[model samples]
Target: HHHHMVHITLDPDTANPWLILSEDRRQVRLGDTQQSIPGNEERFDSYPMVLGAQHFHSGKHYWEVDVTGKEAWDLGVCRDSVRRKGHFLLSSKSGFWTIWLWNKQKYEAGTYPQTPLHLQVPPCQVGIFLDYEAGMVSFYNITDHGSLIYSFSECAFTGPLRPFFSPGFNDGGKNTAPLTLCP
Candidate 1:
C-alpha cells in the first residue's frame, strides 16, 4: 500500500492551487501514455494519489487505491469523460530556473504567474503538495527565500495516460492541512 498524507489548514479566503508528486519525487504528468507491467498496478493508482491531498475543486467519488497486480494502477484523478475538459502539465526549464504549465492537447505554452496569487508555504522548502478537489497545481519557488512560483487551475493530462480518483479518505473525511516542516 502506497501511503500518502495530506494536511490542510488555511484562512477561509485562501485560493492557492496544489500539485501532486510521483513516487520518485517528480511531478505526475497527466499526458503520459506508457503502459506499466501487468499484475502490479498499484504503481499506477492515480486516484489514490489525489487522496494524498485535500482539495476544494469538488467531485462525487471518494479516493481509493488497488493493491493487486492487475492492469495498471489508477494513477491520479481521471479526466471527466463527460466534460472532456483540458488538463494542465508542469515541466522544469533546462537550467531548472523556471517551471511552466501547458495544455496537454494543444502543447501550447501557458502561464500561471498571471493569477497573481501566491501560496503561503514556509520558507527554504522544496516539496510537492496537492489539492485534488480543485484540479489545480501550484509549484513553489523555494530556491532562494520563499514564495509560490505558480498556481494552475483547470488542468488535465493528455494522450492515453489514465488519471483517476481513489475511493477512500486518507484523513477519515475530516479537513486536514498539507504536510509542512522547517528544514
Candidate 2:
C-alpha cells in the first residue's frame, strides 16, 4: 500500500553528539551535554543512535516515524557493519532490526532476548517496512490504518542498510519527544 515510499533524511554525520538535529534534517532530540563534536568514525560512541541518509540494497522500502510524545524510543534497520563502539545490542543479535519504547508502555521487539510488546494503543506514527527481496523487517502502527507492529523474518542481509534511531534517554526532560521523520 505504500508503494515503497521513501524520503528519509537524517545522518548528521552519523549523529550522537547528544543528538539535537532538526534544521531540515527531519527531527531528532535529546540534549544535555556533548555537542562540541569532533572525533568520529561515524559518530555514535555509546548509543543514542542515528543513521539514515538513504541506504538500501534492492527494493521495497518505506519510512515513517513520528513517535509522538515519546518517552524512550528506537526504530529499525542498521547493519552497515554495526558497532560504533562500547556496549552494543539493540539486537537482531547486534545488527539491529529494532523496535522499542522503554518507558511509558515499555514496548520492545528487537529480537534476541528482547521481545515484549503488549500495545493496546500507543503509537503515534511509526511505520517502517523494508523488504529487500523479501528478507522482511516490518513494523507499523501508523496511529491506526497501519496495524502490525513487529516482524523480522528470514533476515540475513549484508553490506549496506541504514535507517536507525534511538531517541531514547533524555529522562531529564522525560524524553523530550522529537523523533519525527515522516513526510
Candidate 3:
C-alpha cells in the first residue's frame, strides 16, 4: 500500500524541561536532571511529553517513531488545541488518539473508551498513519511486518492535528531509552 510519509521533529518549545531533545530535533528522551525553565502555556508541565513541530490539516501522513529499548512510552496524534498546561489523560475526549506501551508488556490504545491491544511481539518501531479527510488514525508495528496494532476510525477532527510523544518517565532509570522520530 502507498503511504504518505511525513517528516517529523520534536518541538522543544512544547516539551517539558526534563525532556532532552537531540540537537537535530528528531529525537527526545528523559534527561537525568530537570532544569529550571519558566512555566509556559505551550510547555507540558505534568507529563514527559512533546509535540511535533509541524501541524497537519488535511490529507494522509505517515511517520515512524523508534521506541526501542524503552520500557514504557506513548505515541500518537492530538489536536493542536489539546491541553498542554495541565495533567490530562490520553483519551479521545481530550482530543488525543494514541497507543501506549506500559512496562514493555502491555499495549493499549488511548481512545474514547480506552482499549487494550494484543500484540504477538513487542514493537521496537511504531508507524503512525493519519488520514485527516477520512478521520482515521492507524498504528502499525513496523518491526513486526507492519502488523496492524490499532486504529481509531471515523474520528471527528475538530481542528488541526499534530503528532505526540512521551518517552515516559525515566522510572528510576528503568526507561532511559530515547523516543526517536525515524528519518
Candidate 4:
C-alpha cells in the first residue's frame, strides 16, 4: 500500500471543514468547530484542531479546539499545531498551493523559522502540509526556508478574529496532487 498527496480547496464563503485522516484510523475533525466522527474510534488520536482567517487585524489568541495549526496556512498568516517526530508540510502563497511530506515532523513548535523570502505581498502558490500518520501529527516543506517570502516553519496566530483569512482563502479551484507508486 502507498499514500498520495491530497489537495483540499479552501472556500472563502464558508470556513472549510475537513477531517485529516488515513484509512483504518479514527477520524480527526479539523475546521472552525469541534465535533467527533461516529463509530467506535478508540484508535482515533484526538488531536482536536481548529483555526480562523480572522487574525489579520485582531484576535491574538489562537481559537484552537484541541489544536490550532492555522499558522501553517498562508493567505495572510501562518500557524501550526503539535508537531510530530518525522515528516513536514510546505506551501506557497503565490500559487495558493501546499506540499505534504512524510519525514519532517521532528520540527516541533517554533523549532523551525519562517524564511524571509516569504515577506513580499501576494505570497507565491507554495506551502506546507500537516497530517496524521500511525498516530502522529507531522509537518513538512516542499522548498527551503524564507520568512518574508515564505515562513519556512509554522507561526502563532496574533491578530483580530472577525474579518481575517482564518479557515482559508477564497482561491476557489479544483486541487489535487499527482503521485506514482514505486516498488
Report the lDDT tens digits of candidate 3 across residue range 77-176: 9999888886667898778989888865878888657798878888999899999999999998888889989889879786889999998886667898
Task: Report the number of the highest-lDDT candidate.
Answer: 3
The superposed Cα distance between candidate 1 and the true structure at residue 31, in angstroms, equals 26
Could you tell me the TM-score of candidate 4? 0.21
Write down the lDDT of every candidate, Cα atoms only.
Answer: 0.28, 0.82, 0.86, 0.25
lDDT of 4 by residue, 1-183 (tens): 014333232222232223343232212233334335433322112322222323233212211111123223222223222222233433222211222211212112222232222222222233322221221122222222422222222322332222112222213321221111111
What are the runs in model 1 whose C-alpha is more than 4 Å off?
Answer: 1-39, 44-125, 156-183
Q: How does residue 167 of candidate 2 score in lDDT? A: 83
lDDT (tens digit, per residue) of candidate 2 on 67-87: 777777888887788878778
Measured on C-alpha atoms, candidate 4 has an lDDT of 0.25
Per-residue alpha-carbon lDDT of candidate 1 for residues 100-147, written as tens digits (9 for 90 to 100): 111211111224222222334322333333344554544443543535
Could you tell which candidate, 1 or 2, scores higher by lDDT?
2
Give each model a TM-score.
0.24, 0.33, 0.95, 0.21
Clashes of 3: 0
Task: Assess candidate 1 and give its lDDT.
Answer: 0.28
What residue pairs clash in candidate 3, if any at all?
Answer: none
Ranking of models by TM-score: 3, 2, 1, 4
Which of the two, 1 or 4, has more TM-score? Answer: 1
